[PDB]
Coordinates of C-alpha atoms in Angstrom, one line a residue:
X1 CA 27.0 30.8 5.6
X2 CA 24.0 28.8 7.2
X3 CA 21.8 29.1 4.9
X4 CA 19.1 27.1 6.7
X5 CA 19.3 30.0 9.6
X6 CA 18.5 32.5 7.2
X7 CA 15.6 31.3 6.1
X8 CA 14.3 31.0 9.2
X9 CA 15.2 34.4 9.6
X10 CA 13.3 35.2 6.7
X11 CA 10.0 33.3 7.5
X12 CA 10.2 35.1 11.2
X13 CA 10.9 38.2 9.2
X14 CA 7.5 37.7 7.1
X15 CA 5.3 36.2 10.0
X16 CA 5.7 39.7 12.2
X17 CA 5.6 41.0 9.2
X18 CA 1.9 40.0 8.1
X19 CA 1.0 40.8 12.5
X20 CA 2.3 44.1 12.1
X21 CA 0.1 45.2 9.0
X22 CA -3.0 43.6 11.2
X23 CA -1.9 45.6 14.0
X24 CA -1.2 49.1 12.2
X25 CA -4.7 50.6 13.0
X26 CA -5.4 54.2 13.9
X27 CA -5.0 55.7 17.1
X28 CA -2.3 51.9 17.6
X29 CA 0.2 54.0 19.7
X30 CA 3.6 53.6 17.8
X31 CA 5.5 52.5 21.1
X32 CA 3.1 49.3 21.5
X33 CA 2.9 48.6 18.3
X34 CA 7.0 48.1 17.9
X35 CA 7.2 46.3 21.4
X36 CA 4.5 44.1 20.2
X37 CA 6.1 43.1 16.9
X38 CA 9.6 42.5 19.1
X39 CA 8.2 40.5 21.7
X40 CA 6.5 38.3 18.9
X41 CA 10.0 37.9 17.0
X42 CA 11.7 36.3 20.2
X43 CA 8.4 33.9 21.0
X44 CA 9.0 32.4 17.0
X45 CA 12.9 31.8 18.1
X46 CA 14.1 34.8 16.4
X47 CA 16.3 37.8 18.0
X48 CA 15.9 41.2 16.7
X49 CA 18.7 42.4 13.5
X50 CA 17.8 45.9 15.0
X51 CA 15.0 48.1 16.3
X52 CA 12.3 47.8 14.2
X53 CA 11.8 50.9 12.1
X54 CA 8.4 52.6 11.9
X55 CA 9.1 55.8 9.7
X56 CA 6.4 57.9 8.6
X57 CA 5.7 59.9 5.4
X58 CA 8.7 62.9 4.7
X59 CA 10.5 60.5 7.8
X60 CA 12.6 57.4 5.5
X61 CA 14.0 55.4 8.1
X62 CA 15.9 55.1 11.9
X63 CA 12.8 56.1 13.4
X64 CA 12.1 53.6 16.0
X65 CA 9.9 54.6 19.3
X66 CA 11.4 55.4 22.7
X67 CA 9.5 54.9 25.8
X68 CA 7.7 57.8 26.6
X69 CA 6.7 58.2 23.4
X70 CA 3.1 58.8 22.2
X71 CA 3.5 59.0 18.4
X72 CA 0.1 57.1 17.5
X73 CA -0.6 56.0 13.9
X74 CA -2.9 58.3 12.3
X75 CA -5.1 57.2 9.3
X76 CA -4.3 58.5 5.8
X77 CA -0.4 58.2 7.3
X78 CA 1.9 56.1 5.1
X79 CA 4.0 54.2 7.6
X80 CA 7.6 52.1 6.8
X81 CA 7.8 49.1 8.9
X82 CA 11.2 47.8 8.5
X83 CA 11.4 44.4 10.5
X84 CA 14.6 42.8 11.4
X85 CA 15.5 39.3 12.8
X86 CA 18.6 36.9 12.6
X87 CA 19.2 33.8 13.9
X88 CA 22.6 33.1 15.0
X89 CA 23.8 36.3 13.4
X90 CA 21.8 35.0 10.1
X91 CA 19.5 38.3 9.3
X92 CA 16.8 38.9 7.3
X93 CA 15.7 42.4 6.6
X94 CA 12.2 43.2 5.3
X95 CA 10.0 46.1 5.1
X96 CA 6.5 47.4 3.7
X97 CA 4.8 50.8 3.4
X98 CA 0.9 50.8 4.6
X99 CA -1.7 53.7 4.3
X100 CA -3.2 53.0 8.0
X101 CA -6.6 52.2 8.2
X102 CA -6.8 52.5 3.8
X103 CA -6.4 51.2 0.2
X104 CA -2.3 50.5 -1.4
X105 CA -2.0 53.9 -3.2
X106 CA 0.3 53.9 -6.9
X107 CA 3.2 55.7 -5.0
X108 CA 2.7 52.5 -2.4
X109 CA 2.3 50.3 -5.9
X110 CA 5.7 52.0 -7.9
X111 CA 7.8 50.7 -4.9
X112 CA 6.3 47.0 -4.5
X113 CA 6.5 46.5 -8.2
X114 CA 10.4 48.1 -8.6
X115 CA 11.1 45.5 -5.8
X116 CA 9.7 42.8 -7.5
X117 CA 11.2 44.1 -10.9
X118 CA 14.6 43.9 -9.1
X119 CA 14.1 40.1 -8.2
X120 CA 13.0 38.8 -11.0
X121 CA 16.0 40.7 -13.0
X122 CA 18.4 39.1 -10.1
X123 CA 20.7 35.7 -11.0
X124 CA 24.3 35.5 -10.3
X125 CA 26.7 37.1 -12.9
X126 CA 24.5 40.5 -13.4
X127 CA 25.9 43.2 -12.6
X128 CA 24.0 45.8 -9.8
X129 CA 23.4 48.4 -11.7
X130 CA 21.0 45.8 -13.6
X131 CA 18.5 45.8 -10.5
X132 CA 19.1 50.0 -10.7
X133 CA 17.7 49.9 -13.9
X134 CA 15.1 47.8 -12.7
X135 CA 14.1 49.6 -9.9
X136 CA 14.2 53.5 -11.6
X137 CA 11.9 52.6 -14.6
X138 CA 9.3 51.5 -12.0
X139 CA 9.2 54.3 -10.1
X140 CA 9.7 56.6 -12.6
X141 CA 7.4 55.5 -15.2
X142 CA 4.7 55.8 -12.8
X143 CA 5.8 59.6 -12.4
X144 CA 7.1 59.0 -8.8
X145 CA 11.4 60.1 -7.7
X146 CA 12.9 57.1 -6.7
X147 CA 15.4 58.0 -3.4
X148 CA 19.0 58.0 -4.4
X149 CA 20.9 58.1 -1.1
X150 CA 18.9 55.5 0.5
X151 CA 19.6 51.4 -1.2
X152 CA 19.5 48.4 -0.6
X153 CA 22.7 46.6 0.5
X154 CA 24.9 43.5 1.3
X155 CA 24.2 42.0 4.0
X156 CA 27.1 39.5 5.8
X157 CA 26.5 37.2 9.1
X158 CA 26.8 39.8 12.1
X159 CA 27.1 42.5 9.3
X160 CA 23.4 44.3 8.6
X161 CA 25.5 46.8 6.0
X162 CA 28.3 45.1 4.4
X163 CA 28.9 47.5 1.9
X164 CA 27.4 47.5 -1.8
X165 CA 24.4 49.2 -2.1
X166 CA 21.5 48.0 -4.6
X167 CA 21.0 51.2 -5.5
X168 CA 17.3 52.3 -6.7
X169 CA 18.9 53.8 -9.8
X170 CA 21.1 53.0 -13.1
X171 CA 24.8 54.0 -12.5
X172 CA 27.2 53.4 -15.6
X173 CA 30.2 52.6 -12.7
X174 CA 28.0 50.3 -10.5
X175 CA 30.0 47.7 -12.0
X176 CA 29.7 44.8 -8.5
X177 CA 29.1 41.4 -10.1
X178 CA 25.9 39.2 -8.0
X179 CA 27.9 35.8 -6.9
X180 CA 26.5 32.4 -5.7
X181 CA 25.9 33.2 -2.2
X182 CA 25.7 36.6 -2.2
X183 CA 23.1 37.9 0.5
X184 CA 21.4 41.1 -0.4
X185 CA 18.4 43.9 1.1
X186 CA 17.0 45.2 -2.1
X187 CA 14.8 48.3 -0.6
X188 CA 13.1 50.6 -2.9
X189 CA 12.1 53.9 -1.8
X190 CA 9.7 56.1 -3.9
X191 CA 8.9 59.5 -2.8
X192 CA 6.6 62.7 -4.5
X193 CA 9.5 64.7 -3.0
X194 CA 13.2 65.4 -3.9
X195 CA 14.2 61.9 -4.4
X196 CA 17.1 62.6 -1.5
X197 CA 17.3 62.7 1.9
X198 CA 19.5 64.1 5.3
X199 CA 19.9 63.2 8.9
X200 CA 17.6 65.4 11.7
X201 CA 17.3 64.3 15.0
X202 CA 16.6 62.5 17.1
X203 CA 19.5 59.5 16.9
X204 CA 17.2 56.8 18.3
X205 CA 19.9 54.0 17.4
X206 CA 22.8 53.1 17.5
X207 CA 25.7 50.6 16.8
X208 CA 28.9 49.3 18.8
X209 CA 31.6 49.4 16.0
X210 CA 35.4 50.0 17.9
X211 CA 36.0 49.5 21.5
X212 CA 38.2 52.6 22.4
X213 CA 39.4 54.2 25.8
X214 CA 36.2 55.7 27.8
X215 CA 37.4 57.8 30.9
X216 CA 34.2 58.1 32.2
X217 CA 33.1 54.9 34.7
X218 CA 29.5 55.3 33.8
X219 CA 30.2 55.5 29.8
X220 CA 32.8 52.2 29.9
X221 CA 30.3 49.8 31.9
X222 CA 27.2 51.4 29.8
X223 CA 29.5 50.6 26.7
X224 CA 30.2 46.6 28.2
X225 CA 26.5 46.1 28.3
X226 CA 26.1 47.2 24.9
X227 CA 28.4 44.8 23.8
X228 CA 27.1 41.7 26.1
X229 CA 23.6 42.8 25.0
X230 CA 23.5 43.5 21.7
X231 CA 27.2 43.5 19.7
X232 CA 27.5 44.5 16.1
X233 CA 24.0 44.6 15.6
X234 CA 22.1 48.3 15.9
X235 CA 20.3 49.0 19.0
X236 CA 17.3 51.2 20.2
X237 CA 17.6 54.1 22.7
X238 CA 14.3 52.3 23.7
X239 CA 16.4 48.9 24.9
X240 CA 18.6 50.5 27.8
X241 CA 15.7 53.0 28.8
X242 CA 14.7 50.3 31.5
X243 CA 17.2 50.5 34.0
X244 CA 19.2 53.8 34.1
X245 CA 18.2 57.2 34.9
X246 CA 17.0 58.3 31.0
X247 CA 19.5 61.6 31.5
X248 CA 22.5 59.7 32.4
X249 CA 21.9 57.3 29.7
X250 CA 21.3 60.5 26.9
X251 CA 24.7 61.8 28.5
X252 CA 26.7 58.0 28.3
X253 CA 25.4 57.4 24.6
X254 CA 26.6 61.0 23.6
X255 CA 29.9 59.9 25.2
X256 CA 30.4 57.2 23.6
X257 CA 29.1 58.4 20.1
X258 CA 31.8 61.3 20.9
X259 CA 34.9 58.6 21.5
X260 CA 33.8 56.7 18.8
X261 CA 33.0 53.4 19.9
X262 CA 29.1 53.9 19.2
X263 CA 27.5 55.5 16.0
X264 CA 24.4 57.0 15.3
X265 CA 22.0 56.0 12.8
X266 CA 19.7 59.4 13.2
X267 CA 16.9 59.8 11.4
X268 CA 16.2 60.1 7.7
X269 CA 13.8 63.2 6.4
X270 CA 12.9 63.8 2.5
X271 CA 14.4 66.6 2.1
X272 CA 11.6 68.6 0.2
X273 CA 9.2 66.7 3.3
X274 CA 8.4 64.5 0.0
X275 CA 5.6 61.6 1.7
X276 CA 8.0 58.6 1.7
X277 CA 7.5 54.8 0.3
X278 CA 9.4 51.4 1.0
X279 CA 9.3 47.5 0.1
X280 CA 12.6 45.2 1.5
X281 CA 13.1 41.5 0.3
X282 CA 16.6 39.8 1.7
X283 CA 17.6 37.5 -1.0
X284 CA 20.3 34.6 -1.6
X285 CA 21.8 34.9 -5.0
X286 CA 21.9 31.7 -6.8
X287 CA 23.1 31.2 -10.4
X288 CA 20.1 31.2 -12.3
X289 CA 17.6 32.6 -10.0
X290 CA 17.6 33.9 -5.9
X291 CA 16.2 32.8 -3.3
X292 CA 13.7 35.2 -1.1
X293 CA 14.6 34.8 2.7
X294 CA 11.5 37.2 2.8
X295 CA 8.6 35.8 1.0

């Protein structure tokens, strides 16, 4: 469990980070802009945990561009970027909302403050729900509807979602004791809608999870590279684009999502359209106090 590699995960995390705030002006075509922050990840050492999410107001998460498309930051738009590096499997996951081109906003505020809430709450030997408490009040108290589908969670070397959610509310049964070494994305969202979300297309991502039999000849060899390329880590539509007809690639991904050896990770709407907040630290528990990978 290098934790040396994780921090430096972390610190590549929070470097493109602080870029891609500097480089989320209006009329910054969305494409460039997650290219840009990609290509500086892998100059400072780092490879990318997955496609770097640039979500948008009612749109939560798993949005990440394609090429082709012309999505351009518009001012007054509250944009998620969720940045992810690791370093020999090592991953640090952080995120920020930004009003482009304006002033932090108290919906912006009620996330960044639950997050910091939840760290400060965080040693080893408190229970999850703890950091639930934590993170609701915040939200809440400032009149906002924290998202309850969409948490934080575990994270494990090769493993982005490992399986126990930090989730952004107080659950009597959320019982999960913090350990020593415990690696965890604590992610707030805060939204003016529902305070719930669903899937809508498009699936922009993707995952390897199973190798499985694939008939098809084009699916099997599309389904190798995947796994040479890019393993158990998620993946952008975006990546394979370059090479490949972009129908016969739609057709192979669809394929393999069918068989099972890929999944999906399609976008998430508020489901009331609800304009959408978000603030990610990775953190090492330690026993009286954590670590933050991300700071």
């Amino acid at each position: 469990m290098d934790t040396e590699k994780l921090m430096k995960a972390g610190e590549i995390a929070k470097k493109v980070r602080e870029k891609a705030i500097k480089l989320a002006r209006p009329g910054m075509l969305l494409l460039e802009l997650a290219e840009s922050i990609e290509k500086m990840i892998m100059e400072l050492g780092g490879k990318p945990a997955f496609p770097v999410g640039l979500s948008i107001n009612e749109i939560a998460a798993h949005y990440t561009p394609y090429k082709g498309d012309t999505t351009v930051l518009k001012e007054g738009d509250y944009l998620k970027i969720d940045v992810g590096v690791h370093i020999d499997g090592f991953i640090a996951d952080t995120a920020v909302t930004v009003r482009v081109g304006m002033e932090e906003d108290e919906l912006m505020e009620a996330a960044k403050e639950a997050l910091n809430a939840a760290i400060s709450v965080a040693r080893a030997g408190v229970e999850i729900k703890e950091l639930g408490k934590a993170i609701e009040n915040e939200i809440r108290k400032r009149g906002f509807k924290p998202i309850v589908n969409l948490s934080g969670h575990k994270i494990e070397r090769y493993k982005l979602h490992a399986g126990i959610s930090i989730p952004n509310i107080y659950r009597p049964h959320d019982n999960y004791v913090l350990k020593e070494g415990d690696v965890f994305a604590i992610e707030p969202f805060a939204t003016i809608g529902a305070g719930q979300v669903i899937e809508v297309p498009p699936t922009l991502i993707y995952m390897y999870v199973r190798d499985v039999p694939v008939r098809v000849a084009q699916a099997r060899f599309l389904l190798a590279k995947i796994k040479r390329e890019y393993g158990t880590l998620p993946f952008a539509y975006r990546w394979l684009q370059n090479d490949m007809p972009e129908g016969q690639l739609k057709l192979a991904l669809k394929t393999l999502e069918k068989a099972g050896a890929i999944y999906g990770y399609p976008v998430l709407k508020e489901i009331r359209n609800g304009i959408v907040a978000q603030f990610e630290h990775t953190i090492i528990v330690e026993k009286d106090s954590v670590i933050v990978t991300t700071e």
